């Protein structure tokens, strides 16, 4: 029979192979192998872990189903604050924002444009490549420690390929179809439906039973880090590419605009494409691309002066 010695080694092989397939399937939204290939290897791993429960590790794909049930969430401080964003609602506000930026910097500036995802803001801390803390934004300086729930979100890596220590921030949301499916299930069980995917994601992440959260099919998009110390990026667009390179799911609709006019074109392009996406967006976020310039602009008490969120009506 398969010995513990042989299983210990085989278990790691399976975790690596299965995690790579999951990265392709959930993070790149582009699987390489047919589902049956993954399922077969997954079953082999489950059999090994069942025979030797000591070989179960936090980065094993079998742990995505959750199991822990908490009494409540511990406070999760953000020593590096999670700021909000100033809002814009008209072409005027956007060009005015550009005027203020040029006034302060003294030259034209490039802008990294991204879609504003309507979900729950999250901060993911990794130490030596290992996922150690998942937290909600809360009030900006203190959120809720929802690490166990986030372990079930399939697109969240449990172990990065490189043992880097960083804290990434983004949005955890519920895709349109998943939101539709969930409300139908609630109607079937006589429960109150969620008013929108935003509330569905928030309500899901507030669940104390991780097994329930694991079935809610939440997804993620990461767009920044709390401390750029371990990162090599010097611009926001570079940061998005680097986040992708280290293993996080990033939104593919971002664009680097060299002028405010290009920025407005972007806003118009995605405004008309708004309902064609598998997820809901409440606008567009415009950020001064160069970190050196973001630094020069600084932050107000509530948000950075180097970014503005154009909110859809
Ligand atoms: N083809 C692939 O690489 C791949 C990777 C992860 C999950 N899946 C599929 O996703 C579904 C859920 O599986 P997991 O809950 O283990 O993520 C299954 O139907 C599975 O086959 C496919």
Q: What is the CATH number of the domain that holds 293?
A: 3.30.1490.70
Query: 249, 270, 305 — which closes off a domain?
Result: 249
154 in the same domain as 218:
yes
Q: Whose CA is nearest to atom 5 of ligand 1?
A: 22
Annotated resolution, angstroms? 1.8
> Residue 185: which CATH number?
3.30.470.30
Q: Which of 43, 116, 176, 302 is catalytic?
A: 116
Q: Is the CB of 134 under 6 A from ligand 1?
A: no
Range of the structural domain that residue 27 is part of: 1-64
Do 221 and 167 share a structural domain?
A: yes
Bridge-based pairing state of the strands 307-311 and 87-88: parallel
Q: What is the DSSP string of the chain?
A: ---HHHHHHHHHHHHHHHHHHHIIIIISS--SS-HHHHHHHHHHHHHHHHH-GGG--TT-GGGGG---B-SSPPEEE-SS------EE-SHHHHHHHHHHHHHHHSS---EEEEEEE-SEEEEEEEETTEEEEEEE-TTSSEEEB-HHHHTT-TTS-SB-SS---EEEEEEEE--HHHHHHHHHHHHHTTPPPPSSHHHHHHHHHT-SBHHHHHTS--EEEEEEES--TT---SBHHHHHHHHHHTT----TT-EEESSHHHHHHHHHHHHHTGGGSSS-EEEEEEEESBHHHHHHH-B-SSSBTTEEEEE--
Query: At a CB cut-off of 8 Å and minimum separation 6, what does 94 contact?
Result: 88, 260, 263, 264, 267, 286, 308, 310
CATH number at residue 43: 1.10.287.610
Q: Are residues 268 and 238 in the same domain?
A: no
The verdict on 160 and 229 lying in the same domain is: yes
Kindly give the distance from the C-alpha atom of residue 35 to the centroid of ligand 1, in angstroms, as a whole number: 6
Could you tell me if the CB of 64 is within 6 A of ligand 1?
yes
How many domains does the structure of the chain reveal?
3
| 71, part of any domain | no
Question: How far, in Å, from the CA of 63 to the mean position of ligand 1?
Answer: 13
199 & 141 share domain: yes
Tell me: do 285 and 184 sit in the same domain. no
46 lines ligand 1 (CB under 6 A): no
- For residues 119 and 110, the answer to whether their CB atoms sit within 8 Å is no
CB 137 within 8 A of CB 303: no
- Paired tokens of 84: 């909000």
- Among the atoms of ligand 1, which is closest to the Cα of residue 24? 3
């Amino acid at each position: 029979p398969l010995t513990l010695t042989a299983a210990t080694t085989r278990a790691q092989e399976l975790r690596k192979q299965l995690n790579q397939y999951s990265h392709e399937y959930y993070v790149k939204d582009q699987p390489s192998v047919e589902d049956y290939v993954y399922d077969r290897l997954y079953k082999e791993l489950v059999d090994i872990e069942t025979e030797f429960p000591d070989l179960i590790t936090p980065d094993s794909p079998t742990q995505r189903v959750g199991g822990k049930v908490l009494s409540g969430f511990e406070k999760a401080p953000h020593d590096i604050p999670m700021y909000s964003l100033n809002d814009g609602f008209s072409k005027e506000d956007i060009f005015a924002f550009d005027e203020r930026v040029r006034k302060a910097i003294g030259k034209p500036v490039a802008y990294c444009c991204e879609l504003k995802i309507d979900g729950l803001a999250i901060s993911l801390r990794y130490e030596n490549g290992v996922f150690v803390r998942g937290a909600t934004r809360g009030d900006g300086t203190v959120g809720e420690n929802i690490t166990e729930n986030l372990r079930t979100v399939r697109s969240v890596p449990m172990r990065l390929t490189e043992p880097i220590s960083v804290e990434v921030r983004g949005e955890c949301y519920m895709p349109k179809q998943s939101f539709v499916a969930l409300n139908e299930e609630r109607e079937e069980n006589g429960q109150d439906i969620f008013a929108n995917p935003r509330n569905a994601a928030a309500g899901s992440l507030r669940q104390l039973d991780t097994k329930i959260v694991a079935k809610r099919n939440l997804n993620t998009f990461l767009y920044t880090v709390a401390d750029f110390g371990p990162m090599k990026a010097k611009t926001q667009f570079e940061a998005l590419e680097e986040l992708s390179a280290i293993g996080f799911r990033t939104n593919p609709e971002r664009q680097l605009c060299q002028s405010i006019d290009e920025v407005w074109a972007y806003i118009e392009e995605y405004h008309e494409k708004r309902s064609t996406l598998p997820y809901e967006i409440d606008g567009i976020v415009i950020k001064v691309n160069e970190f050196a310039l973001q630094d020069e602009l600084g932050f107000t008490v509530k948000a950075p002066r180097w970014a503005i969120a154009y909110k859809f009506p």
